[PDB]
Symmetry: C3
Subunit: 233 residues, 3 copies
């Protein structure tokens, strides 16, 4: 609705998601993906990654703790997923603020991500230009024929033309690490599913904010994490 | 035998050198602490060589393998062997991924005390009920204990075969429950007793914990309750 | 004495210090969540160029050598150099120094680069200063003092009781609970909060000691669950609690 509908697609198709994400959020990413019914796989050697990105239903690239070696493996994965027809998702963590990852993400955009999930500043850096980032998101989306999700208190999602917004959640989500990085992994899995991509991405945003509102009622960030996983399951 | 293994882990507090994948490291350390053991994670090739000779047991889990890590793991296994310390292999996604499979095949030459893997993994390592014949032949060939883990775990020394049932399917909806089992299997090879029986007891300890923790119903609440159940 | 602790609590939330965390593989997530729960902002940046860049920006820098590697050591050095040039305080957590060679040598290299604070257990501070050997930390108190003077640092040598010294003065903190030792990362997370604390206004020594006390009080509250599993979420909650 389409949140309940997305819940059902995830459980029914159980997408296998190649996660190349950052060291702070890996465990939580895997647990989130398992809780919604998907299957996480973390593969990071350049050769293994190339091999696996062709096999997995979808690929997540998150640059939060980028290093030289991991960039090479990530570029390889992206190239083989693209050659295999597998959708890949970019999370441009702190792009705009740190040079190496900024340059790297500009290079990766050539290779046609199915979705880009970031905050206002990240999306502006990449567009070459959440709500004040909206013209940029639309520009970026049109340029790449991709879906862009610019996230915050309200999430905005666009394909260049249509814009959906998704309100809800709770401030507590920001005092716990890896909820946005986990949203990116759910968005990435959602690209592998049938239906309208824009609408599935807005649904993934809704799913995570609904779980977060439930888990936030506990009141503390420690208790939030178990409650959040429980509420996704 | 489960309660006896529980007691022995606490009384010996085995120092376990964990060379495990990035996703399960924290959980592995916290499981080992909860059962009364002592986890240490050492990954520099030189530090790992030094430390492997000192630790009571070594775990090698190839889940997020890289070439650098591979040379550090090779060096750790070689120094453990010469120090007479038992090491355990967890061949994650062997069969699935080429580089990994080649590396694990190379490590078999170095005589692990125990191998812990799923059906597919053990089938691949050896060249399910399907995996039982293969496990028995692997165990025979290397004189190791092989544990094929699943809804029911099977453990073999190549002659006898023990089954361990119980647990809860929810354990599969939480990452690193298998990886953590391998660490407790690694610790248990440092303990006195029959190695086959100690490994089977380790499987039972983790299933018993899991049955208690899954009662809450959800995979988020499972983790604190699992750790609490082990302590 | 508990006054500074309560004050440190409000100051961390008010200043929300941005801490560049170069810490070990096993404790990343928990360090980040602890720094978030106390009202700070963690950032894990590890590429050598990026780390140089970010260390100049951050309010403080934490160096924890727990899973040291050769490549990471290069980035940690770059970071420390740029934090020093920018006048941002940096903190050293010498995990397992003495007991492992490579990182012991590396730590001694870094000691010349003038850390604001050092945080270790008895054996690590002993080995770090170069002094042979219910209250494990007391015995390294002589080693702390000497290191604090030689480098004009603050040294926190932690245990069931924590001792914090600038070489002349010594403050002691107690409480907590031994269950804290049956959970991984509580040490390394304390170092992060110490790193945050060095960036706040006021007396540096007293702020480090206050950090040790904040964590001891949270742990006491979290521990009366009995179990190490329930401890973690209760610990974070307690730190968040106003």
């Amino acid at each position: 609705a389409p949140v309940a509908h997305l819940r059902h697609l995830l459980r029914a198709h159980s997408p296998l998601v190649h996660c190349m994400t950052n060291d702070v959020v890996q465990t939580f990413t895997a647990n989130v993906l398992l809780a919604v019914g998907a299957s996480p796989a973390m593969v990071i050697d350049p050769r293994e990654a190339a091999q696996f990105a062709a096999i997995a239903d979808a690929l997540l690239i998150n640059v939060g703790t980028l290093t030289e070696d991991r960039a090479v493996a990530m570029r390889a994965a992206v190239e083989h997923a693209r050659q295999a027809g597998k959708p890949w998702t970019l999370d441009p963590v702190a792009v705009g603020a740190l040079t190496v990852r900024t340059a790297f993400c500009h290079e990766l955009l050539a290779l046609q991500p199915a979705a880009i999930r970031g905050n206002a500043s990240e999306i502006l850096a990449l567009a070459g230009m959440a709500a004040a980032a909206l013209p940029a998101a639309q520009a970026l989306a049109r340029r790449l024929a991709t879906v862009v999700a610019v996230t915050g208190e309200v999430d905005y999602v666009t394909d260049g033309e249509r814009v959906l917004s998704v309100a809800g959640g709770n401030p507590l989500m920001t005092r716990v690490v890896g909820t946005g990085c986990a949203l990116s992994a759910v968005v990435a899995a959602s690209a592998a599913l049938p239906g309208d991509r824009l609408e599935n991405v807005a649904a993934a945003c809704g799913l995570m904010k609904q779980a977060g509102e439930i888990a936030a009622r506990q009141g503390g960030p420690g208790s939030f994490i178990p409650a959040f996983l429980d509420a996704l399951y």
